[PDB]
Amino acid sequence: KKLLPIVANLLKSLL
Numbered sequence: 001k002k003l004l005p006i007v008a009n010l011l012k013s014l015l
Contacts, residue, residue: 008015
């Protein structure tokens, strides 16, 4: 539900 290309950015790094 959206917010997927953000929380995921902080999790790992660039990707």
